[PDB]
């Protein structure tokens, strides 16, 4: 009768779709609640400075 392209025929999927994605490369910045400085400044007086 005639030739037919593959895309011309609907295809049913025999594969189970298992979607696994990698974990995003995540960069941890230096985060400090109080720096050694803030902490040194937290003192009401510094004997050294005084």
């Amino acid at each position: 009768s005639h030739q037919l392209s593959r895309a011309d025929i609907t295809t049913v999927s025999t594969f189970i779709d298992l979607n696994i994605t990698m974990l995003e490369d995540h960069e941890f910045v230096p985060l400090e609640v109080y720096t050694r400085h803030e902490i040194k400044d937290s003192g009401l007086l510094d004997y050294t400075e005084v």
């Binding site: 109080y34 902490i39 937290s42």
Partner: protein, 51 residues
């Protein structure tokens, strides 16, 4: 939490009053006492004179 102190500029007006007692020997001079005190500057002197 704000562990940092509240900071502000101030101005200290005071007079360093040094009374030195000196003994004068024949060939030398010696301090027999140095009283150092810090006196407040009165308001009438900070407002009228200094400022």
């Amino acid at each position: 939490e704000n562990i940092a102190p509240y900071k502000f500029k101030a101005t200290m007006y005071y007079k360093d009053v040094t009374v030195s007692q000196v003994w004068f020997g024949h060939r030398y001079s010696q301090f027999m006492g140095i009283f150092e005190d810090r006196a407040p500057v009165p308001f009438e002197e900070v407002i009228d004179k200094i400022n």
